[PDB]
């Protein structure tokens, strides 16, 4: 969602 946090390209925390 907007829950996912992307710290660098092609990466995410909290990915759905």
């Amino acid at each position, epitope marked *: *969602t*907007k*829950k*996912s*946090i*992307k*710290i*660098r390209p092609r990466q*995410a*925390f*909290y990915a759905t």
Partner: antibody
Amino acid sequence: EIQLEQSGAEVKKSGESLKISCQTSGYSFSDYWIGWVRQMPGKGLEWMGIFYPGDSDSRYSPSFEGQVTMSADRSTNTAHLQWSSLKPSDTALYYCARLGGDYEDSGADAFDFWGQGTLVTVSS
Amino acid sequence: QSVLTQPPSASGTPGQRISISCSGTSSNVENNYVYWYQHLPGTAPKLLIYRNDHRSSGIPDRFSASKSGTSASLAISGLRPEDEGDYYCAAWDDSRGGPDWVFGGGTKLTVLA
């Protein structure tokens, strides 16, 4: 237009409990993380943590785990920060900010809209 | 790992170009996204640059940023009296393997009046 409106300045005695607030407008409150940032007098900005109102998930900075509690009231679109026992060293300006950016279809990565700050003074 | 180091202060005269630096580690500035904030008296911190070098909407093009290895730099050309205040780099730090946000120490910019 997105706005975060923080509660008014506080003057407290050490040992006393306090809850400060950040009420949000102009976007879906459940869908974005909110962060909290401390600024001690004469010092720089320090990240404290983030809180996700949609499901109450949270992440604290190491220095802050167990020292302060983030929460949210979805009935009023308000995020809160609370201490049970204020110390003089909690004297600071406190900001809430939305984690957003909306640079891509999904996700968040930058603190974009900020509250105006709440000053908290604590004395023994 | 989880610290951004900036010079505590800088100054310049109106119309000069100046540059603000920020040193990180492999945990933050080298591989993750870096941001820059202005903090002016009486106002909340304001995002100037996101994702290393992207200027934020509405910020004038006299603000720019770059990143080389563990260093990042904010350039302000055409310095104005209005620019005096505090400038912070920020980054994501993944040392604990999650999303930790870190602000730099802050640089106080004086525009010599």
